[PDB]
């Protein structure tokens, strides 16, 4: 597998975190994977020409859709799930929750599961 | 006991097989051990018969009782027939520090008998302030325990432990120092009364049995007309 | 204890928004096909709700060819029961009702020409609760 | 001094109807003898002594400190659960006791954590009340039993204050109160906490009723958590 | 609430069923496995790694007058056309909580004795899957279904370049000579592929 | 009293059915045998030594509101996930007195016309078995099912040693170089395998 | 088959019984098997690292379980039955009985059957 680390990027500030040395703050494979997941979610699909069709999501386009609330919930689940699962490190994403806190303004949760989160059987002959 | 998992193992003969049996039987048994002159009910258990009347095949109690037990009777009403001349095995143990060797404790068998109960007391090797009280039946060990030197505890400890169904201690007098070391002192003076059972003595069992109820009665393996 | 009942004299019926005052009997029920299934561990059967079906019966004295002309067209029935001893009134409307059979002809001897109508209704609305 | 002060303070609050369960832990230098004597010295069922320090990422926790975690677990379990064999978060207990030493501590009302196969486990859910255990009071020696009792008193006390001098003391009103209490217990039946329960009019104390002095009686059969198993292998 | 949406893409149609699926929906799931017996041991279950195609079926009626609506005859013609569509359809069922690409296996309409305007429908769907036929190294999986469609004729915009059109509209982007080598594209485009104008109509291949 | 428990282990979930299995449970048993005819004697039954896989099936409904409970949609997603699980599930049925490892063969949910929140379930189980593929001598049989699961990442404790971790967490104990040779384990662990520290996160293979 | 004998160990005293000679008291194959069975029951599984996964039981872990009474009864039957049956000498174990003598404190019986307990057909051509 041998996934590799990457460099931090504070999405709050929209800038790379760099040490007092001036070199960019490296970080772990798992940290890099979390960095990648948020980036992929925020990248719309088919529109940013640098990436292929695999990368990116389509959540923004769903806003203009005329589908009902329940239909939009499933589409959110499909879209987020499809975008994340392309990464090898992903094991499973699910346990989606939704809360239409206002009449038409939504907050939703999901839970991601890594490859390392798997449970291993203990036996040998 | 502490909370947790506990387990034991038993031979299949130890199963509670008394369920499902039927019938009631009576017997005026001659017995070396157990209560004298009274009817006792047994629920068809060999060990119960063994504890209540010993296991001497020479005596009609265990011998015929085993056969009746093998007959699958629900309840066996045993009466310890006796000749009279009844006595219990007894012994008196004495104190060391008194140069007169004061007698302080009297031991006695739980029931009348003539079997060879013996006592061996030796200095407790770990601590001379205590002593090991080992109770014997003939050459066989029957119960062991260490004890404090005070007389009241000694009689209590002998009467306290589980394995003293055979003997009961009794205090004759108080003293400070432990009993004298002795080895295999027989509880002499006892008697089972099996000797020279009279023809008349059977009649006592009959009248005692009358107040009880039973399906059948059988003699104690005797063909006297 | 007090008298606060209601009488059929107080009944007011608007068949499709028209006072069909000549109807001297009406009844409508809203039944449910309650499934009843038996569970392994539970001694008593478990009843599970199901889809509802609305039926209504309405009969009166004929005064015109209203129902025969109406045919099986969908329409509405507004039922209003009003307490007169004290103020307050119940108001129901069957949301979408259709006839199950046109009483095309009916008459006998010197008797008045009675008319009997039976049908079903999809749903209802409770407009006032007394 | 604080323990005695808190002992009196909790005892005072019981008389006010506030049933507070107190958790304590002996001093670090107390041996098994000191701890057991402390538990024997005050054997209130509302008091619990922890008789063992514990480890948690190399940081020692004195028995007084550990009582915080013990109190939290007991409180968190509520009614249904118990800590008879709960696996604690701790990593190692400094005083490791033999079965005989455990038996003495448990008999003394000391609550002791035991190390078992890399797991620190609380044993038997005991409290300080072990001196008497007079028949029915045997159950009172366990924390779960006391927690079960206190909660019912609190719930009845809550329902009490809704009606003291605020509902007419008539047979219909009294029947309303019994219906409220009876239904409340029936919820506990729904939880499986209780096998059998009864609540009825206390005819004796009902002879002298007043506005908030209607009196009632009840009894219930709490379901206990499985604690020990005995097996016999016939062969 | 329950609704059914069929979002065809090769024909950009977002069909919403006017009527809910009658009595009851139901979807099965069956693990793909095989049974094998072994001498002196008996039967055993061996799981097979692959998954299994599963079906969703129901029945409806397309009413003449009811909330958006269309003629039942046209709807039947629409669906019967979609049956032969090689490309997949997206099926979404709100209350049932189903969402995934499917393809219509069978379809049937019916005119009852009365209610001649309506058409009783019985339809069946199959779960859809795709067949995705140097310097080895881990990379993103190709799990995303590539269901997206574009017009067969492109109008060039101001900022466009022929390479950019190829990537946006034909994938790899190096596919631009396929666009250029079409003689119609050669005619409208100048002899220089690198030069292009806003407007020019261009025909992507296939 | 009757209850059903499904104790998944590769996912440490102890599912308890909110609803008892409707009408009636039933389990068959059929001796594994073959029939052979013999000339001038007729038919005969030859027992085959191996056992036979047998099925348990029933049906339920997952109610929306009732004693512990969860959403029916999530429960269906839970079970449908478990259908593809290669590892076995432990099924316990109290009143029926059944207890043994099983695997879900088929599963199906259904939404009736009314009661749209609930989901009628029909599930089937198969009895599970395992395939256990010098100095000959009698020894203990390998009858114990080895159904036990551990996290794929281990946190080293104070008393641990790398050999001990291998045996507790990978069986034979001599398997420790498999743990060490993983480069992540090599990085966190010192160059000496014999030296280890409380905390270090370690990744058992598989 | 040729199972072999072993040495007595009084579980009541937790010590080996030794003769007056000082040598440990040997005992029969069947006695050894009974000695083994009690030991295996008392040995928790997966925890005592000397033994493999086959040896030991899991009865202690069942105490903390939240399963109902009837469920725990079946688990006790499964656990005891599985632990004992690994021994070659076992033929069958069963006839389990349970008695919840108090509200939540249990006593249970079970019967073990040896290989020698089998009944043999009497016939030869």
Whether chain E lies against chain F with 3 or more Cβ pairs closer than 8 A is: yes
Residue F123 C-alpha, separation from nearest chain E C-alpha, in angstroms = 10
Burial E15-39 (b: 16+ CB within 10 A, else e): bbbbebbeeebbbbbebebeeeeee
Of F1, F95, F114, the CB nearest to C49: F114
**Contacts of residue F8, Cβ cutoff 8 Å, sequence gap at least 6:** F14, F15, F82, F85, F89, F90
Q: Phi then psi for C82, rounded to 5 degrees?
A: -120, 125
Nearest to D47 by CA among D81, D5, D76: D5
A67 contacts chain E (CB < 8 A): yes
**Contacts of residue E166, Cβ cutoff 8 Å, sequence gap at least 6:** E172, E173, E174, E175, E176, E178, E179
Q: Searching chain D, which residue's CA lies closest to the CA of residue F67?
A: D191
Q: Searching chain B, which residue's CA lies closest to the CA of residue G113?
A: B12
Residue A88 C-alpha, separation from nearest chain E C-alpha, in angstroms = 6
**Pairwise CA distance, residues B1 & B3, whole Å:** 6
**Contacts of residue G37, Cβ cutoff 8 Å, sequence gap at least 6:** B9, D233, D235, G84, G87, G112
Separate counts of helices (H) and strands (E) for chain C? 1, 10
Residue numbers in D near G114 (CB within 8 A): 235
**Contacts of residue D29, Cβ cutoff 8 Å, sequence gap at least 6:** none
- Contact between residue B127 and residue B149 where contact means Cβ atoms under 8 Å apart: no
A82 contacts chain E (CB < 8 A): yes
Residue F96 C-alpha, separation from nearest chain A C-alpha, in angstroms = 30
- Report CB contact under 8 Å: D228, G47: no
Q: How many CB pairs under 8 A join B and G?
A: 15
- Report CB contact under 8 Å: E138, A55: no
Report which secondary-structure segment, H or E, holds E177: helix E176-181
Report which secondary-structure segment, H or E, holds B152: helix B151-160
DSSP state letter for D158: H
Residue F29 C-alpha, separation from nearest chain A C-alpha, in angstroms = 31
- Contact between residue D47 and residue D22 where contact means Cβ atoms under 8 Å apart: yes
Residue numbers in F near C39 (CB within 8 A): 19-22
**Pairwise CA distance, residues C124 & C91, whole Å:** 11
- Report CB contact under 8 Å: E1, A68: yes
Residue G36 C-alpha, separation from nearest chain A C-alpha, in angstroms = 23
Mark which residues 139-198 of D lie under 8 Å from G by CB.
195
- Contact between residue F52 and residue E43 where contact means Cβ atoms under 8 Å apart: yes
Of B3, B7, B12, the CB nearest to G42: B7
Mark which residues 70-89 of G lie under 8 Å from B by CB.
none
**Pairwise CA distance, residues A94 & A84, whole Å:** 11
Give SS3 for B15.
coil
**Pairwise CA distance, residues F3 & D91, whole Å:** 36
Instruction: Report residue F104 as tokens.
Output: 């879900």
**Contacts of residue E195, Cβ cutoff 8 Å, sequence gap at least 6:** E189
Q: Exposed, middle or buried: residue B68 (CB in 10 Å: 0-12, 13-18, 19+)?
A: buried
Residue F95 C-beta-side C-alpha neighbours within 13 Å: 13
Of C32, C33, C37, the CB nearest to F22: C37
Instruction: Report residue G57 as tokens.
Output: 């039981």
Q: Give the number of other Cβ atoms within 10 Å of residue C82's Cβ.
A: 16
Distances (CA, A) of G28 to G5, G6, G8, G31: 5, 7, 9, 5
Report which secondary-structure segment, H or E, holds D54: strand D54-56
β-sheet bridge partners, residue E170: none
> Is the C-alpha dihedral spanning A28, A33, A39, A45 positive or negative?
positive
**Pairwise CA distance, residues A58 & E14, whole Å:** 17
Residue F146 C-alpha, separation from nearest chain A C-alpha, in angstroms = 6
Instruction: Report residue D11 as tokens.
Output: 């005892």
D228 contacts chain G (CB < 8 A): yes
- Report CB contact under 8 Å: F143, G86: yes
Burial E54-90 (b: 16+ CB within 10 A, else e): eebebebbbeeeeeeeeebeebbebbeebeeeeebbb
B22-30 vs B216-217, strand pairing mode: parallel
Q: Give the number of other Cβ atoms within 10 Å of residue B13's Cβ.
A: 9
Q: Phi then psi for F195, rounded to 5 degrees?
A: -105, 135
**Interface with D, mutate which of G33, G37, G59, G64 (most D CBs under 10 A):** G64
- Report CB contact under 8 Å: E30, F83: yes
**Pairwise CA distance, residues F103 & F87, whole Å:** 8
B73-81 vs B22-30, strand pairing mode: parallel
String of DSSP letters for chain F: ---EEEEETTTTEEEE-SS--SS---------EEEEEETTTEEEEEE-SSB---EEEEEEEE-S-------HHHHHHHHHHHHT-SS-EEEEETTTTEEEEEEEEEEEEEE-SS-TTSEEEEEEEEE----------------S----EEESSEE--TT--HHHHHHHHHSSSTTHHHHHHSHHHHHHS-S-TT------EE----
Q: Exposed, middle or buried: residue B38 (CB in 10 Å: 0-12, 13-18, 19+)?
A: exposed
**Contacts of residue B133, Cβ cutoff 8 Å, sequence gap at least 6:** B119, B121, B144, B145, B146, B147, B154, B157, B158
**Pairwise CA distance, residues F113 & F109, whole Å:** 13
Q: Give the number of other Cβ atoms within 10 Å of residue F1's Cβ.
A: 11
Strands (E) in chain B, as ranges, are 4-10, 22-30, 39-42, 73-81, 90-94, 103-109, 117-123, 131-137, 140-147, 167-171, 182-186, 216-217
- Greatest alpha-carbon pair distance for chain G in Å reads 60
**Pairwise CA distance, residues C94 & C17, whole Å:** 12
- Contact between residue F186 and residue F199 where contact means Cβ atoms under 8 Å apart: no
Distances (CA, A) of A58 to A79, A86, B143, E90, E128: 7, 14, 87, 15, 21
A50 contacts chain E (CB < 8 A): no
**Pairwise CA distance, residues C50 & C60, whole Å:** 33
> Phi/psi zone of residue G81: left (φ > 0), alpha (ψ -120 to 50 degrees), beta?
alpha
Distances (CA, A) of E19 to E4, E62, E72, E73: 9, 7, 12, 15
- Report CB contact under 8 Å: C51, F23: no
D228-234 vs B4-10, strand pairing mode: parallel
H runs (alpha helix) in G1-125 = 29-42, 59-63, 69-85
**Pairwise CA distance, residues E13 & E6, whole Å:** 8
Residue numbers in F near A2 (CB within 8 A): 183
DSSP state letter for A18: B
**Interface with C, mutate which of F16, F20, F116 (most C CBs under 10 A):** F20
- How far out from the chain centre does Cα E114 lie? 35
- Contact between residue D60 and residue D44 where contact means Cβ atoms under 8 Å apart: no
- Contact between residue A121 and residue A102 where contact means Cβ atoms under 8 Å apart: no
State this model's resolution in angstroms: 3.4
Instruction: Report residue E143 as tokens.
Output: 């799990």
SS3 percent helix, strand, coil of chain E, rounded to 5, is 15, 30, 50
**Pairwise CA distance, residues D75 & D148, whole Å:** 11
Instruction: Report residue D188 as tokens.
Output: 């506990």
- Structure-token match 């509802």, residue found: C52
A123 contacts chain G (CB < 8 A): yes
Q: Phi then psi for C124, rounded to 5 degrees?
A: -150, 165
Distances (CA, A) of F165 to A122, F3, F7, F129, F182: 11, 38, 26, 28, 15
Nearest to D124 by CA among D178, D29, D232, D51: D51
Q: Searching chain A, which residue's CA lies closest to the CA of residue E16?
A: A67
Instruction: Report residue B62 as tokens.
Output: 């265990």
- Report CB contact under 8 Å: F2, C41: yes
Q: Phi then psi for A61, rounded to 5 degrees?
A: -65, -25
Nearest to B119 by CA among B51, B55, B181: B181
- Report CB contact under 8 Å: D124, B3: yes
Distances (CA, A) of D212 to D114, D164, D170, D174: 49, 4, 11, 11
- Contact between residue B74 and residue B23 where contact means Cβ atoms under 8 Å apart: yes
Q: Exposed, middle or buried: residue B105 (CB in 10 Å: 0-12, 13-18, 19+)?
A: buried
**Pairwise CA distance, residues A9 & B118, whole Å:** 92
**Pairwise CA distance, residues E141 & A87, whole Å:** 6
**Pairwise CA distance, residues C58 & C94, whole Å:** 13
- Contact between residue F127 and residue F100 where contact means Cβ atoms under 8 Å apart: yes
**Contacts of residue B202, Cβ cutoff 8 Å, sequence gap at least 6:** B28, B81, B219, B220
**Contacts of residue E28, Cβ cutoff 8 Å, sequence gap at least 6:** E54, E55, F106, F107, F108
**Contacts of residue E99, Cβ cutoff 8 Å, sequence gap at least 6:** A74, A75, A77, A78, E90, E91, E92, E93
Instruction: Report residue A44 as tokens.
Output: 């719309």
Q: Give the number of other Cβ atoms within 10 Å of residue D147's Cβ.
A: 21
- Report CB contact under 8 Å: B2, D102: yes
- Report CB contact under 8 Å: F138, G55: no
* Sequence-distant contacts of D112-117: CB under 8 A, at least 24 apart: D112/D50, D112/D51, D112/D52, D113/D50, D113/D52, D113/D54, D113/D66, D113/D88, D117/G44, D117/G47, D117/G48
Burial G74-98 (b: 16+ CB within 10 A, else e): bbbbbbbbbbbbbbebbeebeebeb
Chains with ≥3 CB–CB distances under 8 Å to A: E, F, G
Q: Phi then psi for A19, rounded to 5 degrees?
A: -75, 170
**Pairwise CA distance, residues A91 & D131, whole Å:** 57
Q: Exposed, middle or buried: residue E4 (CB in 10 Å: 0-12, 13-18, 19+)?
A: buried
Q: Strands across the sheet with B167-171, in order?
A: B90-94, B103-109, B167-171
**Pairwise CA distance, residues F11 & A91, whole Å:** 13
Q: Searching chain G, which residue's CA lies closest to the CA of residue D81?
A: G66
β-sheet bridge partners, residue D61: D54
**Pairwise CA distance, residues A64 & F53, whole Å:** 54
Residue D107 C-alpha, separation from nearest chain B C-alpha, in angstroms = 10
G111 contacts chain B (CB < 8 A): yes
């Amino acid at each position: 597998l041998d996934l590799k680390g990457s460099f931090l990027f504070d999405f709050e500030k929209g800038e790379f975190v760099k040490n007092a040395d001036g070199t960019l703050k490296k970080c772990d494979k798992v940290q890099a994977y979390k960095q990648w997941c948020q980036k992929a979610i925020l990248t719309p699909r088919y529109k940013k020409a640098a990436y292929t069709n695999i990368y990116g999501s389509e959540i923004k386009d769903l806003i203009a859709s005329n589908l009902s609330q329940s239909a939009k919930e499933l589409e959110i689940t499909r879209l987020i799930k499809e975008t994340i699962l392309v990464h090898p490190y992903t094991k499973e994403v699910g346990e989606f929750s939704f809360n239409w806190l206002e009449n038409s303004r939504l907050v939703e949760y999901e839970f991601d599961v890594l490859t390392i989160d798997d449970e291993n059987i203990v036996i040998d002959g | 006991e502490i909370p947790g998992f506990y387990n034991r193992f038993k031979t299949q003969a130890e199963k509670s097989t008394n369920t499902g049996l039927k019938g009631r039987l009576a017997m005026p048994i001659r017995a070396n051990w157990g209560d004298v002159g009274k009817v006792v009910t047994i629920k068809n258990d060999l060990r119960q018969l063994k504890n209540l009347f010993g296991d001497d095949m020479n005596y009609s109690a265990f011998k015929l009782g085993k056969l009746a037990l093998l007959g699958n009777v629900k309840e066996l009403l045993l009466y310890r027939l006796v000749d009279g001349n009844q006595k219990k095995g007894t012994l008196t143990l004495k104190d060391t520090t008194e140069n007169s060797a004061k007698d302080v404790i009297k031991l006695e068998t739980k029931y009348p008998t003539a079997r060879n109960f013996n006592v061996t007391i030796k200095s407790n090797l770990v601590d001379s302030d205590k002593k090991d009280f080992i109770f014997f039946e003939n050459t066989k060990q029957l119960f062991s325990s260490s004890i404090k030197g005070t007389i009241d505890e000694i009689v209590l400890e002998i009467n306290s432990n589980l394995d003293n169904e055979y003997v009961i201690a009794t205090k004759v007098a108080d003293s400070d120092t432990i009993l004298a070391n002795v080895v295999n002192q027989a509880l002499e003076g006892g008697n089972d009364g099996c000797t020279s059972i009279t023809n008349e003595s059977y009649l006592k069992a009959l009248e005692e049995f009358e107040r009880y109820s039973f399906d059948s009665f059988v003699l104690d393996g005797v063909a006297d007309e | 204890e007090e008298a606060s009942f209601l009488n059929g004299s107080d009944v007011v019926i608007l068949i499709d928004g028209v006072e069909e005052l000549y109807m001297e009997e009406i009844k409508a029920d809203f039944e449910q096909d309650e499934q009843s299934i038996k569970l392994l561990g539970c001694q008593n059967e478990i009843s599970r709700v199901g889809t509802t079906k609305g039926s209504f019966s309405l009969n009166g004295y004929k005064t015109d060819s209203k129902f025969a002309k109406l045919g099986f067209r969908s329409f509405e029935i507004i039922y209003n029961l009003s307490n007169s001893e004290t103020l307050g009134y119940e108001s129901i409307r069957l949301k979408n009702c259709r006839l199950k059979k046109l009483p095309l002809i009916n008459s006998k001897a010197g008797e008045i020409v009675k008319i009997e109508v039976e049908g079903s209704f999809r749903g209802y609305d409770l407009l006032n609760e007394l | 001094a604080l323990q005695e002060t808190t002992k009196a303070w909790v005892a005072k609050n019981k008389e006010l109807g506030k049933d507070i369960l107190l958790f304590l832990g002996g001093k670090t230098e107390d041996n098994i003898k000191q701890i057991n004597d402390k538990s024997k010295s005050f054997n209130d069922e509302n008091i619990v002594n922890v008789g063992s320090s514990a480890y948690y990422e190399n940081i020692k926790y004195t028995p007084s400190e550990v009582a915080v975690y013990i109190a939290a677990l007991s409180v968190s379990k509520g009614i249904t659960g118990s800590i008879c064999n709960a696996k604690t978060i701790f990593e190692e207990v400094e005083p490791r006791l033999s079965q005989s030493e455990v038996k003495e501590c448990l008999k003394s009302g000391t609550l002791v954590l035991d190390f078992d196969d890399g797991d620190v486990i609380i044993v038997d859910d005991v409290n300080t009340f072990k001196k008497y255990v007079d028949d029915k009071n045997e159950a009172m020696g366990y924390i779960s039993n006391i927690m079960f009792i206190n909660t019912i008193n609190k719930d009845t006390s809550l329902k009490r204050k809704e009606f003291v001098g605020k509902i007419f003391n008539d047979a219909t009103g009294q029947t309303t109160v019994i219906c409220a209490l009876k239904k409340y217990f029936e919820e506990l039946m729904s939880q499986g906490i209780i096998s059998e329960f009864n609540v009825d009019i206390d005819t004796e104390l009902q002879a002298t009723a007043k506005a908030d002095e209607f009196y009632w009686k009840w009894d219930a059969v709490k379901v206990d958590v499985m604690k020990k198993i005995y097996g016999t292998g016939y062969l | 609430v329950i609704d059914i949406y069929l979002k065809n893409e090769k024909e950009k149609i977002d069909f919403h069923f006017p009527v809910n699926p009658q009595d009851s929906l139901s979807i099965k799931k069956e693990k793909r496995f095989e049974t094998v017996d072994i001498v002196n041991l008996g039967e055993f279950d061996i799981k097979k790694e692959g998954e299994k195609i599963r079906e969703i079926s129901f029945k409806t009626f397309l009413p003449n007058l009811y909330s958006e609506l269309k003629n039942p005859i046209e709807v039947v013609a629409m669906l019967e056309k979609w049956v032969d569509q090689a490309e997949p359809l997206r099926l979404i069922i709100t209350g049932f909580g189903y969402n995934g690409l499917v393809t219509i296996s069978s379809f049937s309409n019916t005119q009852t004795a009365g209610r001649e305007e309506d058409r009783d429908i019985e339809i069946t769907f199959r779960t859809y899957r795709e067949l995705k036929i140097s310097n080895t190294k881990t990379d993103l999986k190709d799990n995303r279904p590539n269901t997206q469609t574009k017009s067969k004729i492109y109008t060039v915009k101001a900022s466009d370049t022929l390479y950019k059109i190829a990537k946006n509209l034909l994938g790899k982007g190096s596919r631009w000579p396929e666009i250029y080598n079409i003689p119609e594209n050669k005619k409208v485009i100048g002899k220089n592929p690198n030069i292009i104008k806003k407007g020019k109509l261009v025909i992507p291949s296939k």
